Amino acid sequence: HHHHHHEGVRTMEEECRVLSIQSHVIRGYVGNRAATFPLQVLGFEIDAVNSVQFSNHTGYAHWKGQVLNSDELQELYEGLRLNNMNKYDYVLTGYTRDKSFLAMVVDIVQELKQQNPRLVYVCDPVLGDKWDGEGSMYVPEDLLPVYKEKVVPLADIITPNQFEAELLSGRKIHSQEEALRVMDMLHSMGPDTVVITSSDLPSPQGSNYLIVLGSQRRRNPAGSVVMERIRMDIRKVDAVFVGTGDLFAAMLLAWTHKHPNNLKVACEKTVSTLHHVLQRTIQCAKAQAGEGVRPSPMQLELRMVQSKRDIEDPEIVVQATVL
Template sequence: MDIDNDHRVLSIQSHVVSGYCGNKSAVFPLQTLGFDVDFINSVQFSTHTGYPRWTGQVLNEQDIFELIDGLRHNNLLCKYTHLLSGYARSASFLEAMHSAIKEIKSVAPNVVYLCDPVLGDDGRMYVPHELLSVYKEKIIPLADIICPNQFEAELLSGIKITGMKTALEAIDYLHSLGIKTVVISSTETGFDDTNEQLMTIGSSQLPGANNQDRQLCKLVIPRIPSRFTGTGDLFAALFLAWFTKTKFDLKITMENVTATLNSIIRRTYEYANNKPNGLELPFNRELRIIQSRDDILEPKIQNSAELI
């Protein structure tokens, strides 16, 4: 493992006191894989919002400006090699995040920025609609890598994904905005009539391990019959780590990421099924990330990515 490399990530996304999503899903896997992680919590909630009741605070634009100002005055902004962003709750916060990312890119020109454009899922937005235009016009053009789910890719591209052809059209549109690596983390529509599989589709214009000009891969995994919060945040963090460690080999990265994610979800599913009230309780469905440290360090590849 390349633990001697000086990889330092600034992760800007949500935080929960109890459970796993946002930075709680991202920080431990990144640290386990040898990355130093600094993090700004866009919100701090008691739990994720899938619980019957949740409380907490929302960071505003002035808060992030103050935090960035403190890092700036201590000459720390130039130390970052990677940026990661996820859930934000307001357009004004996204605007402030845009300014921060632009500044970091100006003082650390080789920084790699992965944007997980958290907008919604299952055909429904769960952030205010005005965030979409800020993502499209300001945040996405700064990104080197994006990891939307199918619904988010449709929102960002304006293309309804009904199969592989339209998925590739959406990916090509996002490439046209200047994004070198586009990964649709999960697709559900038009690929599997039995609804028992999920597909990840990735495209990278960065030269990978074999120095090919463009890498285009798909990977199919079995669907586990339940919903788990924080899997997208975990996917993005794992992708950022493995894409770096494999020197931009998209195929190996996708295999490692999905293997780890699948192991964690299966462990969580089995744990929940052995608890009172099973999968009905949100607490039982919290990702078993800490218990999966070995799977994070050494993923057990069971599903191979296929070059398209």
């Protein structure tokens, strides 16, 4: 009787409120631009709170705009508290330069979590990474002291990359047997799901064929804790991409929310989704500028719209191994 299944259309499903306090640009896709469409095309009731609003990202030679301040995001957040619209399922965080905006973000994550003990604060540390081998931070020299004790302790999910992963532990990674150790070192700070978005640790398939690894505990079982882990390698989509960071944690949110406590398929639909993007991204970068040389930011921007088709459900292009 497939006839009472259609009046289901009339039902109240779930509203998965996602407070995503990130940046917004006019042209291009970084931060919140990058985090919404996907999360929306995936049924999430996501709310965007601009941190900035630059004409474009800071990856081009120029940019102009404004930077929302702590005092502003404070008013911004109360307005909600007033008409009582301050209650989320997931608070999503990312790249942030100023320290006061970071403490404020916390407070909001903090109260939201005192207004809702159930909140899932998917947190992605704005620390920095490595370009010509050596590694540098990409923010003020005292953002870590904040990320260390008031952010990560509050977060339920983090997506460090090697350089940052290390910084949120105090040790350092030289092998595969340490990015799991340092991952053990981060839950003690709080995150119960830890992934190391990028690194340098080799793999049975080359340096080009880069890695991804992660761990997820839950001492929820009657007695003690249980802990599952995975890892995976992915050819290096050579081309240089910016926004990808922001999108990762988003899709690593959706798929996470949508599936059981198994980073495996969760992480597979996720790290895969980046592929059905980037491919269709690199491909066009060359579709126009002089049939004889490497592209530019604008000739390289994330072809995000076009990926709707794919976003709604990816064709797994990479497999993972269980541990």
